[PDB]
Amino acid sequence: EAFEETHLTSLDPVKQFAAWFEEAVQCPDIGEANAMCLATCTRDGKPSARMLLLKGFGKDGFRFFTNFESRKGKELDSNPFASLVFYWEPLNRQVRVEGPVKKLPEEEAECYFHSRPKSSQIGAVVSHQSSVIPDREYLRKKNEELEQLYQDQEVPKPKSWGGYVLYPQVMEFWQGQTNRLHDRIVFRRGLGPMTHRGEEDWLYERLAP
Amino acid sequence: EAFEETHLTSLDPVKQFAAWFEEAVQCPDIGEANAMCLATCTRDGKPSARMLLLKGFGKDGFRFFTNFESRKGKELDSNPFASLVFYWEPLNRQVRVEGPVKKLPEEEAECYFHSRPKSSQIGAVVSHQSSVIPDREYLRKKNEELEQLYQDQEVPKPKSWGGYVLYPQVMEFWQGQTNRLHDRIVFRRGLGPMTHRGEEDWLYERLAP
Numbered sequence: 001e002a003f004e005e006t007h008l009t010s011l012d013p014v015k016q017f018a019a020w021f022e023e024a025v026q027c028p029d030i031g032e033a034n035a036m037c038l039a040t041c042t043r044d045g046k047p048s049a050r051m052l053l054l055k056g057f058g059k060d061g062f063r064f065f066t067n068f069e070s071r072k073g074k075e076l077d078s079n080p081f082a083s084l085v086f087y088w089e090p091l092n093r094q095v096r097v098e099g100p101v102k103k104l105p106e107e108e109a110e111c112y113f114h115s116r117p118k119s120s121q122i123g124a125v126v127s128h129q130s131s132v133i134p135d136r137e138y139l140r141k142k143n144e145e146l147e148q149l150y151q152d153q154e155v156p157k158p159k160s161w162g163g164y165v166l167y168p169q170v171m172e173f174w175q176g177q178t179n180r181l182h183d184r185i186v187f188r189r190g191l192g193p194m195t196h197r198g199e200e201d202w203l204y205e206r207l208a209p
Numbered sequence: 210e211a212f213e214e215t216h217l218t219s220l221d222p223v224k225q226f227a228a229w230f231e232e233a234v235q236c237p238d239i240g241e242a243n244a245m246c247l248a249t250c251t252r253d254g255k256p257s258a259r260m261l262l263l264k265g266f267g268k269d270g271f272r273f274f275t276n277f278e279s280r281k282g283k284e285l286d287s288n289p290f291a292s293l294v295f296y297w298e299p300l301n302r303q304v305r306v307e308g309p310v311k312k313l314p315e316e317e318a319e320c321y322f323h324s325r326p327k328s329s330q331i332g333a334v335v336s337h338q339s340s341v342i343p344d345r346e347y348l349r350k351k352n353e354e355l356e357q358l359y360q361d362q363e364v365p366k367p368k369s370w371g372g373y374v375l376y377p378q379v380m381e382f383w384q385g386q387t388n389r390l391h392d393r394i395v396f397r398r399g400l401g402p403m404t405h406r407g408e409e410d411w412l413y414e415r416l417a418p
C-alpha cells in the first residue's frame with residue numbers, strides 16, 4: 001500500500017512507467033490503460049486539454065497521433081511544450097509527464113496511418129479536426145462518398161495528419177493514500193539533501209501531497 | 210447512440226453538464242464521476258495538468274479546493290485561466306470546460322474545510338503541497354504530532370488552503386463513435402450559418418472530430 005523510494009522498480013522513470021503501465025494493462029477493471037489527458041497551451045498562456053491515446057513509448061518519449069490542423073496541433077506547432085496525465089482509478093495511481101514535443105517523421109506517420117482500420121483512415125480524410133461543420137449528416141455523407149472513391153484502393157494519409165513525440169523532462173509517480181497524505185515521487189532532468197540520483201541525467205525528489 | 214443538436218437536454222451548457230453528470234453518477238461502472246483533469250499554465254506558456262475532484266457546480270462555474278502555494282496554485286494566481294476534462298469511459302463521453310478562475314471567499318473555504326473528515330483537515334496542515342520533503346516518514350511523524358495537538362479541538366484551515374471557481378467560457382460535449390467520427394457540440398460565449406443561439410449569451414457549433 002506504501003509507495004516508497006526503496007521499492008522503485010527503476011531509477012529510469014521511463015522503465016518505472018513501463019512497470020506501472022504493465023500493472024494497469026493486467027488489471028481487468030481498466031479499459032484503455034493507454035488513455036491519457038494531453039494539456040497544451042498558447043504561447044500567451046491560454047491552456048487547453050483533451051483525452052488522447054498513447055501509441056508508443058520508450059527512451060525518446062511518448063508518441064501520439066492527431067491532425068496537425070486541429071486546435072491542439074496549432075498550439076503544439078506554435079508552442080512545442082505539453083503535459084500528460086495517466087489516471088488508473090482501480091490502482092489509485094496517477095502518472096504526470098512534462099516535456100517538449102516534436103513531430104514524428106512523415107515515413108513513421110504513413111506506416112502508423114496504414115496500420116489503422118480502413119474505416120478510421122477514411123474518417124481522417126473526412127474530418128478537418130476541430131473546424132466548424134454544419135451537422136453530423138455532413139460527416140456521414142462525405143464518409144460514404146470517400147468509401148466509394150477508395151473501394152479496392154489505398155487511402156492516402158492527409159498531409160495535415162501525423163504524429164508527435166513528447167521527450168520527458170519531468171515524470172511524477174503518484175499513489176493515493178488515506179487522509180490525502182499521498183505518495184509523490186517526481187523525476188526531473190539535471191545536490192541538496194532531499195535530491196537523489198537516478199539513471200543518466202535524472203534526479204528524483206518526494207513532493208508533499 | 211447518435212449525439213444530436215435536436216436532442217440536447219438544454220441550450221444552457223451548465224444544465225447539459227448536469228444531465229450528463231447525473232447519467233455518470235447513476236452508472237455503477239463509474240467510481241468518481243466528479244474526477245476531472247485540471248490544466249493550468251505559466252504566463253509564458255508552460256503547461257501542467259493533474260487530477261482533481263469537482264466540489265460543486267452551477268451558473269457561476271465549477272468549484273475545486275487545493276493549496277494556493279502548490280504548483281497549480283502559483284500558476285492560477287499568476288495566470289488565472291484553466292481548462293477541465295471530464296472523461297466517462299463507460300458512457301464513451303468527454304466534457305471540456307475552459308474559463309477564467311478566481312478564488313472563492315475565505316468564509317466559503319472555511320465552511321468547506323470544516324466539512325471534511327478531521328484526518329483530512331490535519332493532512333492539509335501537515336502538507337506544504339508540491340514542496341520537496343525528505344521521505345514519507347516525515348509526513349507520518351508530523352501527522353501523528355498534529356493529531357496530538359488537535360485532540361478535542363478544531364483544526365484551523367491553513368491560510369494557503371482554499372477554493373477556486375472556473376467561470377465557463379467554452380463547454381464541449383463529446384460522444385465517441387465508430388470510425389473515430391465522433392459527435393462534438395461546443396458552446397461558447399458571444400451569426401454564421403453553422404452558429405446557433407443557446408440560452409443567455411451562449412452560442413453553439415458542431416466541430417469535426
Ligand SMILES: Cc1cc2nc3c(=O)[nH]c(=O)nc-3n(C[C@H](O)[C@H](O)[C@H](O)COP(=O)(O)O)c2cc1C
Binds near residue numbers: 035302303
Ligand atoms: C479515450 C480517447 C482517446 C482519443 N484519442 C485521440 C487520438 O489519439 N487522437 C486524436 O486526434 N483525438 C483523440 N481523441 C479525441 C480528442 O479528445 C479530441 O476530441 C480531438 O483530438 C480534438 O481536440 P482539439 O480540438 O483540442 O484539437 C480521443 C478521445 C478519447 C475520449
Ligand SMILES: Cc1cc2nc3c(=O)[nH]c(=O)nc-3n(C[C@H](O)[C@H](O)[C@H](O)COP(=O)(O)O)c2cc1C
Binds near residue numbers: 257260
Ligand atoms: C482523483 C483525484 C482527485 C484529486 N483531488 C484533488 C483535489 O481536489 N485537490 C488537490 O489539491 N489535489 C487533488 N488531487 C491530487 C492532485 O492530482 C495533485 O497531486 C496535487 O493537487 C498537486 O498538484 P500540483 O503539484 O500540480 O499543484 C487529486 C488526485 C486524484 C487522483
Ligand SMILES: Cc1ncc(COP(=O)(O)O)c(/C=C2\SC(=S)NC2=O)c1O
Binds near residue numbers: 180329
Ligand atoms: C490532496 C487532496 N486535497 C483535497 C482533495 C479534495 O477532496 P476532499 O475535500 O479531501 O474530499 C483531494 C481529493 C481526492 S484524492 C482522490 S483519489 N480522490 C479525491 O477526491 C486531494 O487528493
Ligand SMILES: Cc1ncc(COP(=O)(O)O)c(/C=C2\SC(=S)NC2=O)c1O
Binds near residue numbers: 052065389418
Ligand atoms: C479522432 C481520433 N483520431 C485518432 C485516434 C487514435 O487511435 P486509432 O489510430 O484510431 O486507433 C483516436 C483514438 C481514440 S477515440 C477513443 S474512445 N479511443 C481511442 O483510442 C481518435 O479518437
Ligand code: NA
Binds near residue numbers: 189201
Ligand atoms: Na536529456
Ligand code: NA
Binds near residue numbers: 398410
Ligand atoms: Na458572460
